[PDB]
Amino acid sequence: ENPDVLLSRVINVVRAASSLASQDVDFYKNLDRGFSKDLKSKADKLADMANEIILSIDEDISDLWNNFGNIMDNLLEMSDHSLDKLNCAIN
Amino acid sequence: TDLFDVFEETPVEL
Amino acid sequence: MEDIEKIKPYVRSFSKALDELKPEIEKLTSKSLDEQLLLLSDERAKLELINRYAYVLSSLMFANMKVLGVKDMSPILGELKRVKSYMDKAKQYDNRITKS
Ligand SMILES: [Y+3]
Ligand SMILES: [Y+3]
Ligand SMILES: [Y+3]
Ligand SMILES: [Y+3]
Ligand SMILES: [Y+3]
Ligand SMILES: [Y+3]
Ligand SMILES: [Y+3]
Ligand SMILES: [Y+3]
Protein backbone atom coordinates (compact mmCIF):
# COMPACT_ATOMS: atom_id res chain seq x y z
CA GLU A 1 0.00 0.00 0.00
CA ASN A 2 3.05 2.25 -0.37
CA PRO A 3 2.67 4.01 3.00
CA ASP A 4 5.25 6.65 3.86
CA VAL A 5 6.69 6.24 7.34
CA LEU A 6 8.90 9.28 7.01
CA LEU A 7 6.11 11.74 6.17
CA SER A 8 3.97 10.22 8.89
CA ARG A 9 6.81 10.76 11.37
CA VAL A 10 7.32 14.34 10.23
CA ILE A 11 3.68 15.09 10.82
CA ASN A 12 3.77 13.61 14.34
CA VAL A 13 6.56 16.00 15.21
CA VAL A 14 4.63 19.00 13.95
CA ARG A 15 1.60 17.98 15.97
CA ALA A 16 3.79 17.41 19.00
CA ALA A 17 5.56 20.74 18.62
CA SER A 18 2.31 22.52 17.97
CA SER A 19 0.51 20.89 20.85
CA LEU A 20 3.53 21.78 22.99
CA ALA A 21 3.46 25.38 21.74
CA SER A 22 -0.22 25.82 22.71
CA GLN A 23 0.81 25.61 26.39
CA ASP A 24 2.35 28.60 28.10
CA VAL A 25 5.81 27.22 27.43
CA ASP A 26 7.44 30.63 27.78
CA PHE A 27 5.92 30.82 31.27
CA TYR A 28 7.37 27.45 32.33
CA LYS A 29 10.62 27.93 30.47
CA ASN A 30 11.20 31.15 32.41
CA LEU A 31 9.91 29.69 35.66
CA ASP A 32 12.00 26.52 35.68
CA ARG A 33 15.69 26.19 34.72
CA GLY A 34 15.39 22.42 34.54
CA PHE A 35 12.47 22.67 32.08
CA SER A 36 14.22 25.24 29.93
CA LYS A 37 17.20 22.91 29.52
CA ASP A 38 15.56 19.64 28.35
CA LEU A 39 13.35 21.72 26.13
CA LYS A 40 16.41 23.21 24.37
CA SER A 41 17.87 19.71 24.05
CA LYS A 42 14.75 18.40 22.37
CA ALA A 43 14.63 21.44 20.12
CA ASP A 44 18.31 20.92 19.34
CA LYS A 45 17.47 17.29 18.62
CA LEU A 46 14.92 18.60 16.20
CA ALA A 47 17.52 21.10 14.99
CA ASP A 48 20.13 18.40 14.50
CA MET A 49 17.88 16.43 12.13
CA ALA A 50 17.02 19.51 10.07
CA ASN A 51 20.68 20.47 9.53
CA GLU A 52 21.44 16.87 8.55
CA ILE A 53 18.85 17.30 5.84
CA ILE A 54 20.68 20.46 4.76
CA LEU A 55 24.03 18.65 4.85
CA SER A 56 22.46 16.12 2.47
CA ILE A 57 21.74 18.82 -0.14
CA ASP A 58 24.97 20.86 0.18
CA GLU A 59 24.22 23.24 -2.73
CA ASP A 60 23.19 36.76 12.52
CA ILE A 61 19.55 35.57 12.84
CA SER A 62 18.68 37.78 9.87
CA ASP A 63 21.83 36.52 8.22
CA LEU A 64 20.52 33.00 9.19
CA TRP A 65 16.90 32.97 7.99
CA ASN A 66 18.08 34.57 4.78
CA ASN A 67 20.28 31.52 4.39
CA PHE A 68 17.22 29.23 4.88
CA GLY A 69 15.20 31.08 2.28
CA ASN A 70 18.13 30.42 -0.02
CA ILE A 71 18.02 26.62 0.38
CA MET A 72 14.25 26.40 -0.15
CA ASP A 73 14.80 28.42 -3.27
CA ASN A 74 17.50 25.91 -4.36
CA LEU A 75 15.18 22.92 -3.88
CA LEU A 76 12.15 24.48 -5.56
CA GLU A 77 14.11 25.42 -8.75
CA MET A 78 15.29 21.82 -9.23
CA SER A 79 11.64 20.92 -8.97
CA ASP A 80 10.48 23.59 -11.39
CA HIS A 81 13.12 22.39 -13.77
CA SER A 82 11.96 18.82 -13.39
CA LEU A 83 8.40 19.95 -14.14
CA ASP A 84 9.42 22.09 -17.06
CA LYS A 85 11.20 19.09 -18.65
CA LEU A 86 8.23 16.71 -18.30
CA ASN A 87 5.95 19.34 -19.81
CA CYS A 88 8.39 19.91 -22.61
CA ALA A 89 8.93 16.23 -23.48
CA ILE A 90 5.17 15.82 -23.68
CA ASN A 91 4.85 18.98 -25.79
CA THR B 1 -6.01 13.56 2.53
CA ASP B 2 -3.81 16.66 2.71
CA LEU B 3 -0.44 16.76 4.49
CA PHE B 4 -0.61 20.49 5.08
CA ASP B 5 -3.70 20.34 7.32
CA VAL B 6 -1.36 19.68 10.28
CA PHE B 7 -0.18 23.26 10.10
CA GLU B 8 -3.66 24.69 10.55
CA GLU B 9 -5.23 22.33 13.10
CA THR B 10 -5.57 23.41 16.71
CA PRO B 11 -3.48 21.69 19.47
CA VAL B 12 -5.09 19.60 22.24
CA GLU B 13 -4.30 22.17 24.95
CA LEU B 14 -5.76 21.62 28.44
CA MET C 1 -1.62 27.86 37.61
CA GLU C 2 1.99 27.35 38.63
CA ASP C 3 1.46 23.65 37.76
CA ILE C 4 4.01 22.40 35.29
CA GLU C 5 3.13 18.71 35.43
CA LYS C 6 0.42 19.22 32.82
CA ILE C 7 2.95 20.87 30.45
CA LYS C 8 5.54 18.03 30.71
CA PRO C 9 3.71 15.22 28.84
CA TYR C 10 3.18 17.58 25.88
CA VAL C 11 6.96 17.67 25.67
CA ARG C 12 7.33 13.92 26.12
CA SER C 13 5.02 13.27 23.22
CA PHE C 14 7.16 15.70 21.26
CA SER C 15 10.43 14.03 22.24
CA LYS C 16 8.92 10.64 21.46
CA ALA C 17 8.02 11.91 18.02
CA LEU C 18 11.55 13.26 17.51
CA ASP C 19 13.19 9.94 18.36
CA GLU C 20 10.78 8.29 16.00
CA LEU C 21 11.78 10.85 13.41
CA LYS C 22 15.55 10.27 13.57
CA PRO C 23 15.83 6.81 11.87
CA GLU C 24 13.73 8.05 9.02
CA ILE C 25 16.00 11.09 8.60
CA GLU C 26 19.06 8.84 8.61
CA LYS C 27 17.49 6.76 5.88
CA LEU C 28 16.79 9.87 3.83
CA THR C 29 20.27 11.26 4.33
CA SER C 30 22.03 7.90 3.95
CA LYS C 31 23.25 9.34 0.67
CA SER C 32 23.52 12.85 -0.59
CA LEU C 33 20.41 13.96 -2.52
CA ASP C 34 22.40 14.31 -5.73
CA GLU C 35 23.72 10.76 -5.40
CA GLN C 36 20.08 9.61 -4.80
CA LEU C 37 18.86 11.31 -7.94
CA LEU C 38 21.51 9.59 -10.01
CA LEU C 39 20.13 6.30 -8.78
CA LEU C 40 16.90 7.24 -10.62
CA SER C 41 16.03 7.18 -14.35
CA ASP C 42 12.33 8.06 -14.14
CA GLU C 43 11.95 11.84 -14.25
CA ARG C 44 8.73 11.40 -12.25
CA ALA C 45 10.54 9.57 -9.48
CA LYS C 46 13.03 12.42 -9.33
CA LEU C 47 10.42 15.11 -8.98
CA GLU C 48 8.91 13.11 -6.16
CA LEU C 49 12.07 12.78 -4.11
CA ILE C 50 12.79 16.49 -4.39
CA ASN C 51 9.30 17.59 -3.37
CA ARG C 52 9.57 15.24 -0.42
CA TYR C 53 12.89 16.78 0.65
CA ALA C 54 11.37 20.28 0.42
CA TYR C 55 8.38 19.05 2.48
CA VAL C 56 10.40 17.59 5.38
CA LEU C 57 12.72 20.57 5.78
CA SER C 58 9.88 23.03 5.65
CA SER C 59 7.90 21.04 8.17
CA LEU C 60 10.89 20.61 10.52
CA MET C 61 11.60 24.32 10.25
CA PHE C 62 7.92 24.92 11.02
CA ALA C 63 8.04 22.68 14.10
CA ASN C 64 11.22 24.42 15.16
CA MET C 65 9.66 27.83 14.95
CA LYS C 66 6.60 26.70 16.93
CA VAL C 67 8.72 25.37 19.82
CA LEU C 68 10.95 28.48 19.76
CA GLY C 69 7.86 30.47 20.79
CA VAL C 70 7.72 32.31 17.53
CA LYS C 71 4.42 34.16 17.32
CA ASP C 72 4.47 34.59 13.52
CA MET C 73 4.53 31.47 11.37
CA SER C 74 3.92 33.47 8.13
CA PRO C 75 7.45 33.29 6.64
CA ILE C 76 7.47 29.49 7.03
CA LEU C 77 3.71 29.36 6.19
CA GLY C 78 4.44 31.26 3.02
CA GLU C 79 7.24 28.87 2.02
CA LEU C 80 5.04 25.91 2.96
CA LYS C 81 2.38 27.25 0.58
CA ARG C 82 4.93 27.51 -2.23
CA VAL C 83 5.89 23.92 -1.68
CA LYS C 84 2.23 22.89 -1.84
CA SER C 85 2.05 24.82 -5.08
CA TYR C 86 4.82 22.69 -6.62
CA MET C 87 3.36 19.50 -5.17
CA ASP C 88 0.08 20.54 -6.73
CA LYS C 89 1.76 20.95 -10.15
CA ALA C 90 3.15 17.43 -9.82
CA LYS C 91 -0.32 15.94 -9.37
CA GLN C 92 -2.06 17.91 -12.12
CA TYR C 93 0.78 16.71 -14.34
CA ASP C 94 -0.07 13.13 -13.47
CA ASN C 95 -3.70 13.71 -14.38
CA ARG C 96 -2.54 14.97 -17.78
CA ILE C 97 -0.55 11.77 -18.22
CA THR C 98 -3.50 9.63 -17.16
CA LYS C 99 -5.71 11.24 -19.81
CA SER C 100 -2.87 10.69 -22.29
Y1 LIG D 1 26.73 17.97 1.80
Y1 LIG E 1 28.95 37.49 12.60
Y1 LIG F 1 29.01 35.32 9.69
Y1 LIG G 1 26.69 36.90 7.73
Y1 LIG H 1 25.25 40.09 8.66
Y1 LIG I 1 9.41 27.48 -15.65
Y1 LIG J 1 -6.40 21.61 4.07
Y1 LIG K 1 23.13 11.35 10.28
Q: Does A17 touch chain B (CB under 8 A)?
A: no
Task: Delimit the domains of chain C by residue range.
Answer: 33-99
Best of B2, B5, B6, B7 to mutate (most C CBs within 10 Å, chain C): B7
Distance C34 CA to ligand 1 centre (A): 9
For residue B6, the chain C residues in CB contact (below 8 A) are 59
Q: Return the residue of B nearest to C65 by Cα.
A: B7
Question: What is the spatial distance between Cα C73 and Cα C21, in angstroms, rounded to a whole number?
Answer: 22
| Resolution of this deposited model, Å | 2.4
Question: What is the spatial distance between Cα A49 and Cα C23, in angstroms, rounded to a whole number?
Answer: 10
Do the chains contact at A53 and C28, CB–CB below 8 Å?
Answer: yes
SS3 labels along C2-67: CCCCCHHHHHHHHHHHHHHHHHHHHHHCCCCHHHHHHCCCCHHHHHHHHHHHHHHHHHHHHHHHHH
Question: What is the spatial distance between Cα A85 and Cα A79, in angstroms, rounded to a whole number?
Answer: 10
Task: Report which of A14, A19, A81 is spatially closest to residue C51, judged by C-alpha positions.
Answer: A81
Angle at C52 between CA C48 and CA C57, to 5 degrees: 155
Do the chains contact at C55 and B3, CB–CB below 8 Å?
Answer: yes
